[PDB]
């Protein structure tokens, strides 16, 4: 009966604080350490690597039909991130996360997320690109969760740490200057995680029936983006009250708004596409849309690319056409897509088929 | 009844 | 100096190349690294490494040279570390080595700047122990290091050189012998000199001593 | 240069929380307690001198060494002398051991030396007796294991067996020989302790022996020292330590100090701001040091620690050793120590002696103000030139024992206070050492102190021993030392990080220890701690928080003063705080403050209910280690009503029904650690 | 066996190491003193094993007393 009674090992590691020494300089603030050493060397490898891509920019992107290699999973991809600066191409599917490269072009890891059966991991994210990364991944249901030595050489899988968000499927927003991660889905609210202080800040109010599609944000100039299943886009500051949070609620489309999309700059400008497969850029100050594009009819899913303004569309008759923002052809590779990924920096476009099969292209 | 003598 | 970070690059690459893998040519490897200034911790460890194996006379002469040379960045504990190992090893070869050039040359290498780490216990017992070494030349040298060190740590070696003026003094005093008085006294002289704490109490028997050396009836 | 990007961004989830599992460090088997004081209850002072006619033996020079307890016996007529050496002798000892009972046997016969020896076994039943023998006035020890004493009428020297010497004497034990042949009787003593191990199956490690000499050995008959040569060493080494001084050639080094100038050295032994007491207080810290540095551990423990009287004997030993070796002898020991004569810090002695009476001349003749030695100064100096670069487990430093020592006085224990925290801090194998060197009972005896300047130090120190032994919480609520740290904890003035370790201090003090939580609730701590509650520093509200609740862990009476001061309501601040750890600090106490009820009626219940519902809603939370802790926060609750919740686990195959819905969602976690500890809560409940 | 041979550590063993080269006959003897002294110094000869070990295996000299008591300060014991 009173053997139910656990007890934590909370106590007992908080008193190992007093064991451990205090009055002498961290091991960080060394300017001298191992360990500042080999980050201040993938800092200058980040730098190189940010540079480099920026160069192949400038030259003005040409056709795009380089292969750089072709494997296949043991699932289905589903989502496809790339690691920003350490060649890492993480491709989850229902359960799994493999983690290939396209370098050596080797197969480097292989997780069990941990969730059942019934659930699907949707979005999937980058914690702490620059240095010593995590994982971040969440599933359908709410579940969130994150990994650390994800594609190392003598370690194993290992959950950082894991909680439930909410309660489409699920839809994240990492923003790592900010330290904020904003879950969304079939609820009709927007949670702020903040992973510093690890609690739900603000719960924005969506105002709308539909399911949240897509899920985007800025820094600096607070702007929560967010597409709807409905068609509509709002968009939402979070300085403001919650009553008044609805900033613009403009609807120029109808269907599963498959990507919602805001870039980085100062003139910040939200790329959305619908199932029916139309971009109209929108700006954040304006009621009605500024340029239209109608691209593929039956689109599938899509990408959009950061720095350079790429987009990587997909479609149900095997089409993966690559136009510009402006509405200009580039290619139409001839092979449901259903997951497109541009680097943060490189030209880079990973596609994954129906079919078991992933890809990774390039611009020369 | 320590063993050093100690002045407090 | 327009490009003498690219004059560097290269010259560090090819030292580099040279002191990871003949003989007369890591001599001179070494006598450029620690010459001229550079932009090197792998260096100095690596350095280490060779003056413990070495049988050639040369090498050890001049991996000691370079070490205490490339040790002038010496608070965070990484370096402090590194300096330590380095100069405990340092230390080893001064005391230890047959050939008393080696010895003499490590010893007279180990100069001021480094005194926060010869001031430990460990580096100090090595230090008393050089201070009656086969060669004078070497035990002058120790003593005015020893010396150096009787403000850092008084504790151990206020006593031990207390220990030495008697043992300089009996000499002085009971050996009937022209050397042994000749270099008595000029070890006299450098006790004084480098540790005068010490000696200030003990100046009126140093003095009558010394006094009485003069109204003896050896140049 | 795109390199200020890099720098300036936050790292999130890397924290120790993420990174080091949430577990407590495994106690080391901390094995620094003295487990026995042993007491030496009573003395036996055995002198045969039979003052004036010398044994056939020893043929006596013409001036000779004749000084006996610091009295020539032949000035002062046969039998006064005798009596006068016993008076002497006996206060001596007094200076080491003041409280026990002496009984001199002056020129023994040996039905004399039975009942004195067997009435103190009789008195002192289990304790230790001292058996101390002066034979300089009769034949030297025989081959066959014997020790002579004389005949009722002073015309026979009569043998005694050590056998029956050790018979009559019992176990715990300790033997002073003072004779020529010394050790033949230690010899000859192991030897028939050997005997009678052999006979028992159909009194060794007990008894502890020393000897002025080795068995081949004659004590020196040199006209300046005593004949008591020994004997004095043991129980005036002072004296001879400074006589010893003046007669070897590093005198020349001190001119103007003879014999003469030592006699009226000013002081006493006691008061360590006089010139004697200085010395006396050096020589105390040497002897202490050379022991700590040469011996291994367990003999240092067992000779130097566990009773005064035999500590003191074998720290006045190590100084028999180095005079005696000077004249060709070899004093013996029982548990046999390695050589001590040519330790470093007997160079520090002689320069701390020479500095000291160099002063001699303007002491007393111009009556110049006695300048104090720089020894322990110097020592600091060096202990702190260790801590330096002495980061890890190489050699441990010299000076420790010095440390200790310094503690005693006021003059430089600031300082050592100081120097002695940032030892300890360097990590627990520190504390270890500086428990085992025995730092413990004098740390403890200055929280008696009002010296605000200690606070900072001591409130320090005992964090850091408390983190490793904790069993040290017996110790301090004995001494009513942990008023001491509720006085630190109640004081706005002092610093946010000490009394930070202050709120550990009472949280260990109080942990699982009805003595410690009886005593700190009395003085007052429920109130100290909720005025610290809403601090601008997150350790603090955390410890605060632990501390509050291990306070009222099955403790019925601090519950009801919590309530009083309503101190569950003040703790809801801290369950929407930032830091994670502060979240569950709080957690924990509020499970805590529920699980101690005993079955109370509405006042109890009805806390309980508004403590559930504010926990209950720390199930969507980010920190899966604030979700175990509110688990095992509503374990408690669970066992504390367990047939209510069996009443909704069986209905589902109403506060009642929402915890065990929490319990559900903490059941199906995405963290593996809480989904399996709710589970086993849950179905314990099943 | 009777003084303090600390101080004088390196005054004897670059001596007596030298013995062992420069002739053949005072080789048994000399280790002898040379074991004498290690056991006089203890861990104060550990700076020392290094050198002389390098002129050990030169010549083969394998002493009972002496490998017994550098193999007891390099590992922490002494009788």
Known sequence: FISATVQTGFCDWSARYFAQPVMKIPEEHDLESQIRKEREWRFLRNSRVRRQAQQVIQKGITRLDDQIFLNRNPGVPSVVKFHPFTPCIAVADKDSICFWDWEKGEKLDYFHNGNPRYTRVTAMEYLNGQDCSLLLTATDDGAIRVWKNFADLEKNPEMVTAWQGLSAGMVVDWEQETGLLMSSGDVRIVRIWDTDREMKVQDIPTGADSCVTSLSCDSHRSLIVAGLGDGSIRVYDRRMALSECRVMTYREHTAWVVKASLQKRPDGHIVSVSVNGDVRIFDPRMPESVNVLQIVKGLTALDIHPQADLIACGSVNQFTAIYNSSGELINNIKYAISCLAFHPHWPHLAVGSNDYYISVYSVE | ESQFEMDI | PQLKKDIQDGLLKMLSLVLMXXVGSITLALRTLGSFEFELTQ??????????????????????????????????????????????????????????????????????????????????????????????????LAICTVGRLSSMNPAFVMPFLRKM?????????????????????????????????????YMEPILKALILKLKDPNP | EADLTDWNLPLAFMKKRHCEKIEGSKSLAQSWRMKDRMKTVSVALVLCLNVGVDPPDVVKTTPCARLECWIDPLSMGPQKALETIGANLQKQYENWQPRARYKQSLDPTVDEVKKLCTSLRRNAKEERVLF??????????????????????????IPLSIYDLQTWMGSPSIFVYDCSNA?????????????????????????????????????????????????????????????????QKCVSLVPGVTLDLIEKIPGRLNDRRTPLGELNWIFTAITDTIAWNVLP????????????????????????????????????????????????????????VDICLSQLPTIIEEGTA??????????????????????????????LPIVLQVLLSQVHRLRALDLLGRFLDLGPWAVSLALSVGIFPYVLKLLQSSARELRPLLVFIWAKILAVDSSCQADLVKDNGH???????????????????????????????????????????????????????????????????????????????????????????????????????????????????????????????????????????????????????????????????????????????????????????????????????????? | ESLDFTDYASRIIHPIVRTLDQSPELRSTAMDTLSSLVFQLGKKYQIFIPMVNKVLVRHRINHQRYDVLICRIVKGYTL
């Open chain 3, 43 to 140: 260096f100095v460890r690596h350095c280490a490494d060779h003056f413990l194996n070495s049988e050639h006379k040369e090498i050890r002469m001049e991996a000691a040279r370079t070490c205490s040379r490339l040790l002038t960045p010496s608070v965070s504990q990484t370096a402090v570390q590194v300096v330590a190992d380095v100069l405990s090893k340092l230390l080893v070869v001064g005391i230890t080595d047959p050939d008393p050039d080696i010895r003499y040359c490590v010893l007279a290498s180990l100069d001021e700047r480094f005194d926060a780490h010869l001031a430990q216990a460990e580096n100090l017992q090595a230090l008393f122990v050089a201070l009656n070494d086969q060669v004078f030349e070497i035990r002058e």
């Open chain 3, 165 to 201: 003026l008697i043992q300089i003094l009996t000499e002085l005093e009971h050996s009937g012998i022209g050397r042994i008085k000749e270099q008595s006294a000029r070890m006299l002289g450098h006790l004084v000199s480098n540790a005068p704490r010490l000696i200030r109490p």
């Open chain 4, 132 to 157: 101390h023998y002066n034979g300089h006035g009769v034949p030297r020890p025989t081959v066959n294991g014997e020790v002579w004493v004389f005949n009722k009428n002073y015309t026979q020297y």
């Open chain 4, 183 to 247: 050790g033949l009787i230690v010899k000859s003593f192991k030897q028939f302790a050997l005997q009678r191990e052999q006979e028992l199956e159909v009194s060794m490690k007990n008894c502890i022996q020393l000897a002025a000499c080795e068995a081949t050995e004659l004590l020196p008959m040199i006209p300046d020292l005593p004949a008591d040569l020994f004997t004095s060493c043991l129980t005036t080494p002072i004296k001879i330590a400074l006589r010893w001084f003046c007669m």
């Open chain 4, 297 to 352: 551990r367990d003999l240092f423990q067992k000779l130097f620690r566990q009773d005064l009287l035999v500590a003191s004997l074998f720290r006045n030993f190590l100084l028999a050793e180095r005079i005696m070796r000077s004249y060709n002898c070899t004093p013996v020991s029982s548990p046999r120590l390695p050589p001590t004569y040519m330790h470093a810090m007997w160079q520090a002695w002689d320069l701390a």
């Open chain 4, 370 to 399: 006695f300048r104090h030695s720089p020894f322990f100064a110097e020592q600091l100096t060096a202990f702190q030139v260790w801590l330096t670069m002495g980061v890890e487990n190489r050699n441990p430093p010299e000076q």
């Open chain 4, 483 to 686: 008023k001491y740290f509720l006085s630190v904890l109640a004081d706005p003035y002092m610093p946010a990080e000490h009394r930070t370790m202050t709120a550990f201090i009472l949280a260990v003090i109080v942990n699982s220890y009805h003595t410690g939580q009886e005593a700190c609730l009395q003085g007052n701590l429920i109130a100290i701690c909720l005025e610290q509650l809403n601090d601008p520093h997150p350790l603090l509200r955390q410890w605060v928080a632990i501390c509050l609740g291990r306070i009222w862990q099955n403790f019925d009476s601090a519950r009801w003063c919590g309530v009083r001061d309503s101190a569950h309501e003040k703790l809801y601040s801290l369950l929407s705080d930032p830091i994670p750890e502060v979240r569950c600090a709080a957690v924990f106490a509020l499970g805590t403050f529920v699980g101690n009820s005993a079955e109370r009626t509405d006042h109890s219940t009805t806390i309980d209910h508004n403590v559930a519902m504010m926990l209950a809603q720390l199930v969507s939370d980010g920190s899966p280690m604030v979700r175990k802790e509110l688990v095992v926060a509503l374990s408690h609750l669970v066992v504390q009503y367990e047939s209510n919740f069996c009443t909704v686990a069986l209905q589902f195959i109403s506060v009642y029904t929402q915890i065990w819905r929490v319990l559900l969602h903490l059941a199906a976690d995405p963290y593996p650690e809480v989904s399996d500890v709710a589970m086993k809560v849950l179905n314990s409940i099943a």
